[PDB]
Amino acid sequence: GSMKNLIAEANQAVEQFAGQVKARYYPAYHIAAKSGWINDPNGLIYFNNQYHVFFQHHPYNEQWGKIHWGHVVSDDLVHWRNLPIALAPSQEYDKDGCFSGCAIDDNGVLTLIYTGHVVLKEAGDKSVFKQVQCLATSKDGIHFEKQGVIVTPPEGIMHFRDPKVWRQDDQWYMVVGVNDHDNTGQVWLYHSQDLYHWQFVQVLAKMADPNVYMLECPDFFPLGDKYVLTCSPQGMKANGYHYRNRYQSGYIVGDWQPGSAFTITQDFTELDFGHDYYAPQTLISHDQRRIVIAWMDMWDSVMPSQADKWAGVLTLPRTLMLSSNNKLLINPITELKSLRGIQKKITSINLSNAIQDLQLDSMQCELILKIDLTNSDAERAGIALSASPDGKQSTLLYVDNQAQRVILDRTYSGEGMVGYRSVALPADKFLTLHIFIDHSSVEVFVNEGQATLTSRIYPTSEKRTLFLFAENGALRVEQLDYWQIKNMRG
Amino acid sequence: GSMKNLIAEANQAVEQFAGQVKARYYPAYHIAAKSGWINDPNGLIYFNNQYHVFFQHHPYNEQWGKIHWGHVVSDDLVHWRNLPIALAPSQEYDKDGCFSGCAIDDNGVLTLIYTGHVVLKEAGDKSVFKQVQCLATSKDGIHFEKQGVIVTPPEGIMHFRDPKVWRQDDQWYMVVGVNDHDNTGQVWLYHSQDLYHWQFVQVLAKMADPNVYMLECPDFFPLGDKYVLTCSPQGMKANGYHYRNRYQSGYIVGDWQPGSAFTITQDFTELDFGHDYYAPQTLISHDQRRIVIAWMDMWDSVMPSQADKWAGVLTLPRTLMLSSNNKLLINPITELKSLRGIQKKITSINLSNAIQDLQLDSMQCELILKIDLTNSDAERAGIALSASPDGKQSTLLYVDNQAQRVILDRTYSGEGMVGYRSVALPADKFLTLHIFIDHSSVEVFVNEGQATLTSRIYPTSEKRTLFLFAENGALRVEQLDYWQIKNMRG
Numbered sequence: 018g019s020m021k022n023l024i025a026e027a028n029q030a031v032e033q034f035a036g037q038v039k040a041r042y043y044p045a046y047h048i049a050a051k052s053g054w055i056n057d058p059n060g061l062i063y064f065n066n067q068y069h070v071f072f073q074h075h076p077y078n079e080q081w082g083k084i085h086w087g088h089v090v091s092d093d094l095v096h097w098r099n100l101p102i103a104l105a106p107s108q109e110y111d112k113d114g115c116f117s118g119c120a121i122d123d124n125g126v127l128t129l130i131y132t133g134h135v136v137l138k139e140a141g142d143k144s145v146f147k148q149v150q151c152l153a154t155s156k157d158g159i160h161f162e163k164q165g166v167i168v169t170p171p172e173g174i175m176h177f178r179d180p181k182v183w184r185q186d187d188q189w190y191m192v193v194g195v196n197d198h199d200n201t202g203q204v205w206l207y208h209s210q211d212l213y214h215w216q217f218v219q220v221l222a223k224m225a226d227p228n229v230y231m232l233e234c235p236d237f238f239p240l241g242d243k244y245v246l247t248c249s250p251q252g253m254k255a256n257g258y259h260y261r262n263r264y265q266s267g268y269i270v271g272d273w274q275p276g277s278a279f280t281i282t283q284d285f286t287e288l289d290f291g292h293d294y295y296a297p298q299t300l301i302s303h304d305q306r307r308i309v310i311a312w313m314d315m316w317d318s319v320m321p322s323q324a325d326k327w328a329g330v331l332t333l334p335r336t337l338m339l340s341s342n343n344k345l346l347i348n349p350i351t352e353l354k355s356l357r358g359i360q361k362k363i364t365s366i367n368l369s370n371a372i373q374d375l376q377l378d379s380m381q382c383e384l385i386l387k388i389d390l391t392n393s394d395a396e397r398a399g400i401a402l403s404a405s406p407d408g409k410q411s412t413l414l415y416v417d418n419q420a421q422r423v424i425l426d427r428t429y430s431g432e433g434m435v436g437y438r439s440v441a442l443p444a445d446k447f448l449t450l451h452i453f454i455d456h457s458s459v460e461v462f463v464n465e466g467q468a469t470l471t472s473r474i475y476p477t478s479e480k481r482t483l484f485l486f487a488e489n490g491a492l493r494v495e496q497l498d499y500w501q502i503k504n505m506r507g
Numbered sequence: 508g509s510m511k512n513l514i515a516e517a518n519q520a521v522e523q524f525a526g527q528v529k530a531r532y533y534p535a536y537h538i539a540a541k542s543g544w545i546n547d548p549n550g551l552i553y554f555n556n557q558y559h560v561f562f563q564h565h566p567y568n569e570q571w572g573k574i575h576w577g578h579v580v581s582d583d584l585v586h587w588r589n590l591p592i593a594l595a596p597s598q599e600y601d602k603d604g605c606f607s608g609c610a611i612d613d614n615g616v617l618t619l620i621y622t623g624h625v626v627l628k629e630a631g632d633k634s635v636f637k638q639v640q641c642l643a644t645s646k647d648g649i650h651f652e653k654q655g656v657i658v659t660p661p662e663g664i665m666h667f668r669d670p671k672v673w674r675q676d677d678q679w680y681m682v683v684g685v686n687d688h689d690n691t692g693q694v695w696l697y698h699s700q701d702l703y704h705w706q707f708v709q710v711l712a713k714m715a716d717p718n719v720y721m722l723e724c725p726d727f728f729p730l731g732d733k734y735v736l737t738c739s740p741q742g743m744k745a746n747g748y749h750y751r752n753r754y755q756s757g758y759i760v761g762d763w764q765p766g767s768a769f770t771i772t773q774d775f776t777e778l779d780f781g782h783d784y785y786a787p788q789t790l791i792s793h794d795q796r797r798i799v800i801a802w803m804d805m806w807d808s809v810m811p812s813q814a815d816k817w818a819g820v821l822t823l824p825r826t827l828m829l830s831s832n833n834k835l836l837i838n839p840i841t842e843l844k845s846l847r848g849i850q851k852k853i854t855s856i857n858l859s860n861a862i863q864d865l866q867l868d869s870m871q872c873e874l875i876l877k878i879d880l881t882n883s884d885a886e887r888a889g890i891a892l893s894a895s896p897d898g899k900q901s902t903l904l905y906v907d908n909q910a911q912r913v914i915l916d917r918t919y920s921g922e923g924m925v926g927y928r929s930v931a932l933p934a935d936k937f938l939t940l941h942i943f944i945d946h947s948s949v950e951v952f953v954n955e956g957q958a959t960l961t962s963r964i965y966p967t968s969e970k971r972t973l974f975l976f977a978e979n980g981a982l983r984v985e986q987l988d989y990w991q992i993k994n995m996r997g
């Protein structure tokens with residue numbers, strides 16, 4: 018009945034199915050629950066000399082359900098350790114889930130502000146539910162006490178969730194995602210002097226596309242001389258290379274100060290051009306980097322890991338910086354270098370109408386691949402990642418010189434989803450692909466952070482290698498750096 | 508020694524290796540030699556109630572060599588019958604080949620005007636050769652007599668070939684392709700009152716790209732209120748979706764009359780966006796259609812048919828018409844309908860994340876596939892042509908909704924070359940693909956003739972079927988019409 022008892026029950030279920038989890042897809046250096054389901058990252062914070070990441074968590078099986086907050090901690094944003102569950106559904110206001118939210122430091126008290134979800138009427142997608150913002154506190158960073166409801170929506174507002182709270186001008190601001198009366202997605206700004214009493218301030222953002230019905234997981238933060246709004250729009254129609262995933266995640270850059278409109282200088286841009294990037298949240302690092310972590314997954318995708326009694330991975334943490342033209346440069350955090358093992362360097366590799374097995378283990382590795390775009394004139398040329406030794410199964414990451422795009426094609430990757438994602442080739446003589454491979458994922462950082470591609474892969478082969486390939490012309494690889502990547506957990 | 512003897516020797520070699528030709532790749536309703544090698548179509552003409560097509564022909568084996576003119580004839584541009592070879596190399600001026608050319612009606616005498624090729628110095632690609640325009644006559648349409656050299660180039664001009672001659676204002680005009688002193692490709696216009704004495708008139712055309720070193724196979728003809736120049740540029744660099752083949756074939760539309768510049772209103776456009784389209788030539792049909800036939804092949808491509816003692820196919824004949832914005836609408840000739848056998852009609856086929864074997868023989872067939880582009884939202888959706896029953900081998904023709912292009916991918920087609928060609932989706936609710944499949948070829952006419960894709964394929968499967976497929980969304984086929992296509996030869 019009590020949350021302490023419900024957390025104990027949840028932790029025992031997670032521990033019970035942990036023994037059934039197979040290593041084939043389980044990430045060596047990304048955040049997952051010990052077993053069961055996770056989605057969105059929550060309560061990102063640097064608190065009492067440690068990095069906390071919580072996440073949407075169903076402890077009882079490998080499918081979404083009665084959502085808890087799971088919890089990991091690290092000293093260095095890299096060596097993540099599993100902790101006991103932080104929040105279980107227990108009260109009338111959060112009976113059917115402790116949905117997404119944030120963490121703040123309330124004068125030495127770690128405070129979680131989260132959406133409490135309760136179903137008022139079961140009717141599938143026509144279901145009626147209540148969503149309010151709730152508050153919990155911890156003295157020890159492990160055990161949390163609920164302090165009840167702090168924000169209730171106007172009458173006729175149902176979708177009202179994903180609070181993100183920050184301190185400014187001796188008060189607190191909150192952004193939430195809302196489905197308004199006219200069925201448009203909006204980010205609403207609220208404020209409070211005390212964290213318990215909140216007043217609506219303004220509609221902070223709404224999108225020009227009238228088919229966007231929800232903006233999930235808003236995060237509003239300063240970066241250089243601008244404010245950035247990260248969010249996850251729902252209802253954007255896929256349009257050419259744009260908005261390919263079931264749901265979008267992206268950023269809007271503009272100008273704001275208290276009492277003013279958020280005036281947009283850079284319109285909604287996707288944060289990641291791959292298959293599996295949803296519900297980003299940010300924190301400030303000890304040294305004042307802006308760091309983003311997202312769910313490395315997508316609603317309604319085939320999830321082959323579910324046969325192994327677990328599902329859900331978070332992305333690598335990434336730095337955000339504004340370019341001179343106010344686009345985000347996105348890079349992996351420098352601390353991941355601490356996972357590097359055996360290094361291998363190859364210089365000046367030319368291929369023409371040929372494939373080459375690099376004979377490098379693709380289970381858990383980091384690559385820097387520098388490609389000469391002028392002299393790589395092949396119709397298709399690049400690397401086959403997480404590849405069977407027979408080359409029949411692989412994840413294809415390559416230059417398409419007809420499209421003039423970088424392609425990540427998972428058609429032959431293994432189990433689950435087929436097809437490709439892409440980014441335009443950068444306007445540069447050289448393409449640098451900084452590639453992170455884990456047991457069921459590929460993350461690509463292009464050039465100086467101009468673009469990223471994140472996709473889940475489910476290879477079925479016992480041995481995983483890397484091939485280079487050039488079709489109908491030449492590939493010129495200036496340099497290939499490879500590192501084995503160590504298990505973050507030990 | 509005599510050409511009559513050299514033609515007899517050539518015909519006997521062709522007849523000798525005809526028995527070794529396998530049906531697997533040999534076309535049922537396209538022009539090929541009985542055995543040995545062919546390239547460019549030559550001497551296209553409607554003469555004495557029949558359609559003549561000649562072609563560059565090496566009778567002695569399945570590789571390019573000492574070029575002859577082979578010859579087929581039809582009553583209807585469809586039921587092509589093999590004839591004896593028309594020209595063999597015999598004189599000092601054509602010792603190393605009877606290279607490309609045309610036919611005209613000289614007051615009831617069928618006249619061939621062709622480039623005579625002789626190698627002056629063997630040095631591979633550094634070889635020195637002599638190319639002059641030569642004339643031959645026939646009284647019977649089968650046996651030809653050489654009348655000698657009629658046009659010699661200026662001093663220092665070596666590449667000088669592919670004459671195309673027409674009657675206008677009681678004189679004869681000739682276009683030839685030239686590599687000029689500065690190493691630019693040009694089309695030169697000459698004229699004659701008598702077919703034997705010719706005078707240079709003007710540089711008719713040159714391309715803005717200074718890297719174009721040759722314009723092969725020029726044809727200059729009126730169409731509506733414009734003049735069209737078809738030609739095959741050499742040295743255009745592949746650039747995104749443009750100029751993908753080793754060498755280009757295309758058209759320039761503009762204004763001309765005698766004494767005037769050819770003023771360009773529509774700059775060089777590719778005639779065909781597929782893999783295998785080179786060296787077009789045109790004729791006027793009996794009913795005054797402008798008809799184009801090309802080599803359905805490409806220099807330096809893998810040619811799997813060469814294991815079967817033959818190589819070289821011509822394209823279907825196609826009508827040319829000017830659109831209101833002065834682009835060519837290109838359509839198959841109506842007479843091909845005469846080859847249709849067993850018809851099958853399927854209406855309203857929907858697929859979502861699925862494949863479907865249509866169980867239709869893909870050896871020799873004609874399809875009209877009408878696709879609803881609004882409701883076909885799949886990332887990749889269309890048809891697998893000439894497919895193994897296990898679906899492992901096929902030629903993929905589909906809508907890519909990310910690229911917003913039609914893709915013809917021969918990566919899994921069988922033997923030889925991999926990769927794709929493409930056209931932009933037309934601005935229309937419906938995509939109509941009019942598809943002609945033969946034993947080693949696919950030809951696609953898009954919508955009203957806005958674009959065509961022509962590619963050779965070499966399927967290795969005993970049975971060839973058709974699949975529909977939709978990946979990551981829906982395919983809506985409004986209608987699929989299928990016909991078996993009969994052997995044109997009987």
Ligand SMILES: OC[C@H]1O[C@](O)(CO)[C@@H](O)[C@@H]1O
Pocket residue numbers: 056057073084116117118132178179233234295296
């Ligand atoms: O698990 C429920 C949570 O997941 C989301 O729908 C996005 O992935 C959030 O808006 C919600 O708080």
Ligand SMILES: OC[C@H]1O[C@](O)(CO)[C@@H](O)[C@@H]1O
Pocket residue numbers: 546547563574606607608622668669723724785786
């Ligand atoms: O076979 C030689 C002939 O082929 C071409 O090079 C183009 O395919 C022509 O310019 C030449 O007359």
